[PDB]
Structure 1
Amino acid sequence: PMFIVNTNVPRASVPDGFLSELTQQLAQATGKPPQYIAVHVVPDQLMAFGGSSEPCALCSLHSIGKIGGAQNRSYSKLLCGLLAERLRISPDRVYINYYDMNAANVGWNNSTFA
């Protein structure tokens, strides 16, 4: 799985250990070894949510499997919770796009997962 967070929160407000915490929590939430988890945090972004420059985040979670209605609700609770606790972003100022990828459409290590 791959999780990307784009936010207007400044770099200095991203706490030490955040990428590792996201890796660990996503590994547990998806039921997959942490070796498969990639995380990417992009602070200091020029963005608005609802026309407001208050803290917000635009995120993506891509995975081969483990994406669906109930699972995505659970991921959203987990991830909004982390963004609220660690970056002080209100959950109603977060969008997370979920992508259920086919193995043939994910490249890695000179090939794909198909």
Structure 2
Amino acid sequence: PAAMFIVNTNVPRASVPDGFLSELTQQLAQATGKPPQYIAVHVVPDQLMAFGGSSEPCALCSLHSIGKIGGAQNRSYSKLLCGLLAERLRISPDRVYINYYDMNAANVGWNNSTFA
């Protein structure tokens, strides 16, 4: 029942709060209904990026999850995640993409095996 979230951004490392990974973990756990133990998070600052040809702060993100992905859920996650990026990283929400992936258990390895 793994899930993982990655944020790639041009904002500098010093502007990513030290608690941001834990905030994301906790908020995603609540949003997906998964124990936080199952959630992994990866933040990549200082990237060379443009969004719409401009290099104001932006983010390209991905959420890969075994289940809990779908049209309505994804609309809800986008509000959650845009809110977090807007407040903590000062990124305008119209400069964020989030790609959503519903992963089959057989296609997620963990602990020397897969979830299937």
1:67 is paired with a residue of what secondary structure?
coil
Using the size of structure 2 for normalisation, the TM-score is 0.97
Q: Distance in 1 between matches of 2:75 and 2:12?
A: 27
Q: Could you tell me how far 1:9 is from its partner in structure 2?
A: 0.3
Q: Could you tell me how far 1:51 is from its partner in structure 2?
A: 0.4
5+ residue gaps, structure 1: none
- State the Cα deviation string for residues 40-72 of structure 1 (Å, max 9, x = none): 000000000000000000000000000000000
> Alignment RMSD, CA only?
0.3
Q: Distance in 1 between matches of 2:98 and 2:19?
A: 21
Q: Which residue of 1 aligns with 2:61?
A: 59
Q: Give the alignment partner of residue 13 of structure 2, picking from 6, 11, 14.
A: 11
Instruction: Calculate percent identity across the aligned residue pairs.
Output: 100
Q: Could you tell me how far 1:16 is from its partner in structure 2?
A: 1.8
5+ residue gaps, structure 2: none
1:6 is paired with a residue of what secondary structure?
strand
Large movers: runs of 4+ above 3 Å: none
- The count of corresponding residues between Structure 1 and Structure 2 is 113
Using the size of structure 1 for normalisation, the TM-score is 0.98
